[PDB]
Amino acid sequence: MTLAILAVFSVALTLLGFVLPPQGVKRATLLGLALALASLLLTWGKPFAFGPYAVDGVSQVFTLLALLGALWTVGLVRSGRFEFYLLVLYAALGMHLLASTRHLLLMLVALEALSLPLYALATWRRGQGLEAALKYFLLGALAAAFFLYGAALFYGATGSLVLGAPGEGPLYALALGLLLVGLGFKAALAPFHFWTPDVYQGSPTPVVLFMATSVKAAAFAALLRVAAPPEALALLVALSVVVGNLAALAQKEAKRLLAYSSIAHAGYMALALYTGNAQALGFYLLTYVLATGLAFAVLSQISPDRVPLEALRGLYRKDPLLGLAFLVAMLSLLGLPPLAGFWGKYLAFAEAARAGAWGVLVLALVTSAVSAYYYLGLGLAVFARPEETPFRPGPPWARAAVVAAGVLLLALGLLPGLVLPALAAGG
Amino acid sequence: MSLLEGLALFLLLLSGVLVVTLRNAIHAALALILNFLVLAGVYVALDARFLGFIQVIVYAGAIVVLFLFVIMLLFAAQGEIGFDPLVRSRPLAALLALGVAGILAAGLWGLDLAFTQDLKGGLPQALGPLLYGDWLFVLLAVGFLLMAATVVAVALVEPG
Amino acid sequence: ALFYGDRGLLSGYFGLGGAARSLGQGLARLQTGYLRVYALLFVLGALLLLGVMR
Amino acid sequence: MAPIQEYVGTLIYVGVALFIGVAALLVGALLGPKKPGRAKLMPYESGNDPAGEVKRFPVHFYVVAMLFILFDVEVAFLWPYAVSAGGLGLYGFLGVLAFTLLLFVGFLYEWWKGVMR
Amino acid sequence: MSYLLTSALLFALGVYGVLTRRTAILVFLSIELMLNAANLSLVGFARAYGLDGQVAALMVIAVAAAEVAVGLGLIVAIFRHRESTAVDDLSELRG
Numbered sequence: 001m002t003l004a005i006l007a008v009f010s011v012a013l014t015l016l017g018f019v020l021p022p023q024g025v026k027r028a029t030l031l032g033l034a035l036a037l038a039s040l041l042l043t044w045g046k047p048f049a050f051g052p053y054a055v056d057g058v059s060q061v062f063t064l065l066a067l068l069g070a071l072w073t074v075g076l077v078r079s080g081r082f083e084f085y086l087l088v089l090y091a092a093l094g095m096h097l098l099a100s101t102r103h104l105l106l107m108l109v110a111l112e113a114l115s116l117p118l119y120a121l122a123t124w125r126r127g128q129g130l131e132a133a134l135k136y137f138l139l140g141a142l143a144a145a146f147f148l149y150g151a152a153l154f155y156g157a158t159g160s161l162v163l164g165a166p167g168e169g170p171l172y173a174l175a176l177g178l179l180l181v182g183l184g185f186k187a188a189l190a191p192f193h194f195w196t197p198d199v200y201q202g203s204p205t206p207v208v209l210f211m212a213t214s215v216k217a218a219a220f221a222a223l224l225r226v227a228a229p230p231e232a233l234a235l236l237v238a239l240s241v242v243v244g245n246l247a248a249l250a251q252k253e254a255k256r257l258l259a260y261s262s263i264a265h266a267g268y269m270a271l272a273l274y275t276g277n278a279q280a281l282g283f284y285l286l287t288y289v290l291a292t293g294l295a296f297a298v299l300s301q302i303s304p305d306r307v308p309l310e311a312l313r314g315l316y317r318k319d320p321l322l323g324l325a326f327l328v329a330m331l332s333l334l335g336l337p338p339l340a341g342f343w344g345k346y347l348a349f350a351e352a353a354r355a356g357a358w359g360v361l362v363l364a365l366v367t368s369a370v371s372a373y374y375y376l377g378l379g380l381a382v383f384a385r386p387e388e389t390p391f392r393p394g395p396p397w398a399r400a401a402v403v404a405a406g407v408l409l410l411a412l413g414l415l416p417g418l419v420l421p422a423l424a425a426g427g
Numbered sequence: 428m429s430l431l432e433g434l435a436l437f438l439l440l441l442s443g444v445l446v447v448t449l450r451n452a453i454h455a456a457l458a459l460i461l462n463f464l465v466l467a468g469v470y471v472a473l474d475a476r477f478l479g480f481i482q483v484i485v486y487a488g489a490i491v492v493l494f495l496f497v498i499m500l501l502f503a504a505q506g507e508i509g510f511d512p513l514v515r516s517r518p519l520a521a522l523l524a525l526g527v528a529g530i531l532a533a534g535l536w537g538l539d540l541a542f543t544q545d546l547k548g549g550l551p552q553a554l555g556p557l558l559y560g561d562w563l564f565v566l567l568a569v570g571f572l573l574m575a576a577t578v579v580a581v582a583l584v585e586p587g
Numbered sequence: 588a589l590f591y592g593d594r595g596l597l598s599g600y601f602g603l604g605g606a607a608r609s610l611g612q613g614l615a616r617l618q619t620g621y622l623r624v625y626a627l628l629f630v631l632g633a634l635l636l637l638g639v640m641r
Numbered sequence: 642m643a644p645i646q647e648y649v650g651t652l653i654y655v656g657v658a659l660f661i662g663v664a665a666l667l668v669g670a671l672l673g674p675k676k677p678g679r680a681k682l683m684p685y686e687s688g689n690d691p692a693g694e695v696k697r698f699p700v701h702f703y704v705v706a707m708l709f710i711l712f713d714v715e716v717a718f719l720w721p722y723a724v725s726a727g728g729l730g731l732y733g734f735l736g737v738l739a740f741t742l743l744l745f746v747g748f749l750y751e752w753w754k755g756v757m758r
Numbered sequence: 759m760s761y762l763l764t765s766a767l768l769f770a771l772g773v774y775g776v777l778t779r780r781t782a783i784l785v786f787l788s789i790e791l792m793l794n795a796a797n798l799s800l801v802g803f804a805r806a807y808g809l810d811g812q813v814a815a816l817m818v819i820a821v822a823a824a825e826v827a828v829g830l831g832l833i834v835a836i837f838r839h840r841e842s843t844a845v846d847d848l849s850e851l852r853g
Contacts, residue, residue, distance in 0.1 A: 007571060011746055014578060018753050051564030083582040090575040097568060105814045106565045112821050113572045116828045120579050123835075130836045131848040134782070135622055137832050138845075139629065141789050141825055142776065146633075148818060149769055149796035152811070153534070156762070156799065159807040161814055170641070174534030177637045191632035194618055194625040198851040235639050239632075246611030247618075247853060256853075260615075370607060436764045443768050447775030447788055455784060459791060466794060471648065473761060475801045475812050478819075481717045485819055486794070489713045490826050493706035497830050498783060500698045503843060506781035511846035516627065520777035523630045524770050530637045531766035535759075540806045542759065548642045549804075549812050551721035557813045558721045559729055559736040565813075566718065567736070569820045570743040573711055576824035577747040580707055581754060583831035584700060618853035622845045627777055703834065707827045714823045717816075 002039045002063070003053065003100075005032065006093040013089065017082030025082035029089050030074055036092075037067040045426030052103030052162065059100045061282040061423055062221035065289045066095045069213030072293050072405075075397050076206040076300050087117040088210065095214055099221035102163040104151035104179065107222060111147065111182070114218065115140055118211060124204040126305050132202025139195050143182040150178025163225050179226055187219040189270060190239035193263045197247075200259035204304045208255060209296030212262060213289045220269055220285060224276050233273055234360045240267030241363060245370040254299055254307040257374055261333065262292075264371055268335070268364060272348040274355035281351075282423035283416060284344030287409060291332035291341060294405040298326050301394050312378055314386020319393060323382040325406040330379030332409050334372055340412040343420075435472070438465050450507050452498045456491055463487040475549035704756045715744045761802045768795035780844045782833050786826075793822050 009032035017025045040060055047056040070092045077084060094114025101107055119140070122133035151161055153175035158165035167176075185192040200208050244264030251257030265288065272281040298315075299307045301322070316323030332341030345368075352361045393399075412419055421427060442465065445458035463486050470479035498504065547553055558566055617628070685691045722729065722737040729736075768791060775788025797815040804811030837843045 010571075011574070011743065014574070014746055014750050015753070053564055081582070083578065086578060087582070090579070093571070094575075103565065105817055106568060109565060109568045109572055109817060109821055112825055113568065113575060116572075116825060117575055117579050119828065119832060120583050128850055131851055133832060134836050134845075134848065135625065135851075137829055138622060138782070138785060138789075139625065141786065141829060142626070142629070142792075144821075144825060145769075145772070145789055145792040145796065148793060148821075149799065151814070152765075152796045152799040152803065153531075155807060155811050155814065156535075156803045161810060171534040171538055173640050174530065174637070177640055180636070181633055191628060191635075194628055197618060197853055198620070198625075202851055229640065231639055232636055235636060243614045243617075246607065247615040248611070249608050250612035250615030250853065432760065436760055439764055440767055440771070443771035443791055446791060447771050447778065452781065452784055456787060459787060462791070463794075466798060469761065469798070470801055473801050474805050475815075477721070478797075478801065478812050478815055481720075481816065481819060482797075485710065485713055485717050485823060489706075489710040490790070490823060493703065493710050493826065493830060494783070494787065496702050496706045497834065500700065500703055501834070501837070501843075502697065503781055503783060506779070506784055506844075508780075508842045509844045509847060510780075511621065511623075511844070512780075513621075513623070513846075516623065517778065519627065521774060523627065523634065523777060524774035526634050527630070527773050528767055528770035530634065531769065532763065535762055535766065538759075540759070540803075542802070542806045544805065544808045546805055546809055546812075549801075549809065550642060552642075552724050553809070554813060554816075555721035555725035556729060557810065558718065558816070559733045561810070562813050562817065563736050565817055567739055567743070569817055569824075570715075570718075570740040573714060573820065573824050574743050574747040576827050577708075577711055577744075578750055580827045580831040581751050583828065583835055584704070585754070585758075612853075615853035620849040620852040622848070623777065623780075630773065630777065700834065700838075703830070707830065710823050710827055714820050718820070 001048070002036045002043070002055070003050075003093070003096065005036045005039060006089070006096060008032075010086070010089045010093060013082070013086060017086065020082065022080040022082045022085075026074070026078070026085055029085040030071065032089065033067055033071045033074065033092060037064065037071070040064050040067065044422070047426075052101045052106040053097070054100055054102065057423070057425055058221060058224060058278050058282070059096075060426070061278075062099045062217050062285065063096050065217040065285055066092065066099070066214040069210055069217065069289060069293055072213075072297060072401060073206050073210035075401060076209070076297065084121070087121050090117040091115075091121070091210075092214070095218035098218045102225055104147075104154055104161045104163065108144070108148055108151060111186070112144065114215070115144075115186075118207075118215070121207045121210070122199070122203045124304060126204075128202040128305075129204065132199045135195055135202075136199050139185070143185040146178055146185075147182025150175060150181065153178050163227070167227070173229075176227055176229070177232075180228055180232065183219065183223050183226060184236065187216060187223060187270075188240075188259075188263050188266045189236045190243045190263055190267070193240070193243065193260075196259040196263055197256045200262075201253060201256040201306065205255065205296060205300040205302075205307065206304065209293060209300060212258070212296060213293045216262070216266065217285055217289060220266075220281060223273065224278055224281065228273060230274065230355070230357060233270060234357060237267050237270050237360050238363050240264060240270065241367040245367045245374075248371065248374050251374065252309060254302075254309050254312060254378070257309065257378075258295065258299075261371060261374065264367065265333065268345055268348055268368065271352035271357075271361065271364060274357055275351040277347065277351045279420065279423040280344075280347030283340075283347050283412075283420055286419065286423075287332055287340035287344040287412065290405045290409045291329040294325055294402050294409075295329040295333070297398060297402050297405075298322055298329075301392060301398060303390050309378065309381065310387050311389045313381045313384040314389070316382045317386055318391055319399075321399065321403055325402045327379040327382050328406045328409060330375045332413075334375040334379075335368060336372075338410070338413045340409050340416065342413060343416045432472075435465055435469055439469070450505070452504050452506050453495070456494050456498065460487050460491050463491070470549075474546040477549050477551040477554055479549075701756060701758070704758075708751070708756075711744070711747065715741070759802070762799050765795045765799040765802070768792070768798070780846070782837070782843045782845050785845065786829055786833065790822065790826070793818070 248260030
C-alpha cells in the first residue's frame with residue numbers, strides 16, 4: 001500500500017497546487033515521496049500483491065532505489081511551477097507500477113504512466129531540450145507499439161497476458177523477443193542506445209539525474225520478470241559494452257559521455273539477467289544508483305543545460321568534498337575495489353559465470369577496462385587546475401545529500417554483509 | 428467468410444499502404460479513417476463488437492479528428508518540404524519493412540489455433556465484469572494514466 | 588638497439604590505444620543526429636536480435 | 642447478444658444511402674450551365690483576400706479535441722459498467738466511481754486553469 | 759488466422775511509414791497504425807484464448823489515446839513558432 005500513498009498525493013496535489021504557492025507544493029511532493037519510501041522499509045519482509053499489481057522483494061528493492069532517485073531530483077529543482085513536481089510524482093508511481101506486475105498490458109499502461117510525464121520534464125525549453133524531447137517521444141511511442149504487439153503475441157503463443165505462461169516454440173520465441181524490444185529500449189542497451197546520448201545531453205541535468213537513476217532501476221526490475229534466452233543476452237551485452245565504452249571514448253561532454261558509459265553499464269547489469277539473481281542485481285543497482293545520483297547532482301550544481309568535461313576540473317580546490325565524492329562515483333561506476341560498485345559488478349559477473357557464459361563475460365570485462373579511460377578522465381580531472389567554470393555551491397541539502405550517497409556507497413563496498421544478507425527475502 | 432473476408436482484408440492492407448504512401452497528410456489520415464472503419468467491421472466479424480464500436484468512436488471519431496485538427500491548424504498537408512530526402516534510404520526503409528513481416532510470418536507459420544470459443548460477440552455486456560473485475564486494476568491504472576496525460580498535455584502547451 | 592626497440596614497443600601500444608579510440612568514434616560517428624537515422628539504425632538492430640533468437 | 646443477420650442489413654442501409662447520395666451528386670453535376678472564368682472560381686469578396694494570409698489557427702480547437710478524446714475514452718469505459726451495473730454490485734460501483742473521480746480531477750484541473758486560452 | 763497475418767503486415771506497413779515519413783505527424787500516424795495491428799492480433803487471439811485479449815485491446819486503445827494527446831501536444835509545441843516540421847531540421851545533437 002505504497003501505491004495508495006502515491007496515487008493519493010499525485011491526485012490531491014493536482015488540485016491543491018491551485019491554492020498553494022509552488023514552494024508549498026514542492027514541500028508537499030517531497031514529503032509524499034519520502035513517506036512512500038518509509039512504507040517500503042516498514043514492509044521489508046512483508047511482500048504484498050493485490051491485482052496484477054504485486055509487491056515482493058524485487059519490487060521492494062528496486063522501488064526503494066527509484067524513490068530515492070525521485071527525492072534527490074526534486075531536491076534540486078526550484079522552478080515556481082507546481083507541475084514540475086507533479087510530473088515527477090506521476091512518473092514515480094508509473095515506475096513503481098512497472099516494477100510491480102507481471103501483466104503485460106498493465107505493464108504497458110505502467111510504461112505509458114512513467115514515460116509520458118518525462119517527455120514534458122525534458123523541457124527547460126532550451127532549443128536542444130525540444131529536440132531531445134522530440135526524439136524521446138517518437139522513439140518512445142515506437143517502442144510502445146513494439147511492447148504492445150509483443151504482449152499481443154505472448155497472448156498469442158499462450159492463453160495469458162501475464163508472464164510465466166508455459167510457452168511454445170518459435171511463436172513464443174518471437175513474442176518474448178517483442179517484449180524484450182521495448183523493455184530493452186527503456187534500459188539503454190545497445191543498439192537501442194541511440195536516444196541515450198542525445199537525451200542526456202539535451203535535457204536539463206537534474207531531470208537527467210532522475211532518469212539515469214530511477215528509469216534504469218524500474219526497467220531492470222521489469223526486465224527480470226521476462227524469460228530472456230542466453231544468445232540474445234550475449235548479443236545485447238556485447239554490443240552495449242563495446243559501443244558504450246568505445247563511443248564514450250569519443251565523448252567531449254560530461255552528460256553524453258555519461259550516457260555512453262551508462263550504455264556500457266546497462267550492458268554489465270544485463271549479465272545478472274543470465275541467472276536473474278536479483279539479490280545480486282538488487283545490490284548492483286543499489287551501488288550504481290547511489291553513485292550516479294551523486295554524479296548528476298554534481299553535474300546539476302555545475303550547469304542545468306550542459307556540462308563539458310573540463311568543467312569538472314579543479315572541482316577539488318573549489319569544494320573538496322564534492323571533488324572527492326565525484327571521484328568515488330567515477331570509481332564505483334568503474335567497478336573498482338573496495339567500492340560497492342565492485343560488489344555489484346562482481347555479483348553480476350558471478351551470476352554470469354555461474355550461468356557458464358564465458359566469452360560474453362570476458363568481452364564485457366575487457367571493454368569494462370576500456371571504460372577506465374574516461375572514468376579516470378573525470379575522477380582525476382577533479383584535481384587539475386580549474387579553468388573558467390560556472391559554480392553554484394549548493395544548499396546544505398545538496399552537500400549533505402551527495403556526501404551521504406558516497407558514504408553509503410563505500411560502506412557497502414566494505415560491508416555488503418550488511419544489506420546483501422537481505423536483498424533476498426528480507427531477513 | 429472467405430468470399431467477403433478476402434475483400435475486407437485486402438481493403439485493410441490497401442488502406443494501410445495508402446496511409447504510409449500518400450504525401451498528402453490529410454489524404455493519409457483519411458485513409459487511416461477508412462482503415463479504422465474496415466478494421467472495426469472485421470473486429471465485429473471476429474466476434475469482437477463493442478471493441479469495434481469504440482474503435483470507430485474513439486479511434487476514428489476522436490483521435491484522428493484531433494489529428495486532423497492538428498494538420499489543419501498547422502497546414503503540413505504538403506509534408507515533403509525542406510528535404511534531406513536521403514533517397515538511398517527509401518529502398519532501405521522499404522527493405523526493413525519487408526523483414527519485420529517476414530519474422531512475424533515465420534512465428535505465425537505452422538501455427539494452428541483453436542479459434543473456437545463461444546465469445547458470444549464481444550458486447551460490453553460480457554466485457555464489463557472483466558473490466559471491473561480481473562482488469563479493474565489495469566483500468567484504474569489506465570484512468571490514472573489519462574489524468575496524468577491531461578495534466579501533462581496541458582502543461583505541455585500552456586504558453587506563459 | 589634493443590633500447591630503441593623497446594621505445595618503439597611502447598609507441599605501438601599507444602597505437603592500440605588509438606585504435607580503440609578510433610573505433611570508438613566510428614561508433615560515435617554512427618550517430619549523426621538525424622532522427623530518421625536513429626529510427627533506421629533502431630529497426631536494423633531489432634531485426635538483428637530477432638534473427639539471433641533462432 | 643443479437644444476430645449477425647441484422648448488421649448485414651446495416652451494410653445494406655449504408656449501400657442504399659450512399660447510392661442515393663451519389664445519384665444526387667450526379668443530377669447536380671450533369672444538369673447545369675457550366676462557365677468557368679477566372680472571376681467565378683476565386684474565393685470571396687470582390688478584391689478578395691477574406692481568408693487572406695494567416696499563419697495558422699488558435700490551438701483552442703486542438704484543446705477541445707484533446708479534451709474530447711480523453712473524456713470520450715472515459716465514456717468508452719463507462720459504457721460497459723452502465724450495462725452491467727446492479728450486476729456488478731457495490732464494488733463495481735465503487736470501481737467505476739474511482740475511475741470517474743480520477744478523470745474528473747483531470748477535468749477540474751484543466752478548468753481552473755481553463756481554456757479561454 | 760488470416761487476421762493475425764494481416765495484423766503483422768499492417769505492423770510492417772506502419773514501419774515503412776515511420777521510416778519513410780519526413781514530417782513528425784505522419785510518423786506518429788504510422789505508429790498509430792502499428793498499435794492497431796497489435797490490437798487486431800489481440801482480437802484474433804482473444805477469439806482463440808477467450809476474450810481477455812479484447813479487454814486488453816480496449817485498455818490499449820485508451821493507452822493510445824493518452825499518448826496521442828501528449829504526443830500531439832509535443833508536436834505542437836516543438837513547431838508552433840518553428841516553420842516546416844521535417845524531422846531532419848533538428849540535427850544539433852550529435853555523437
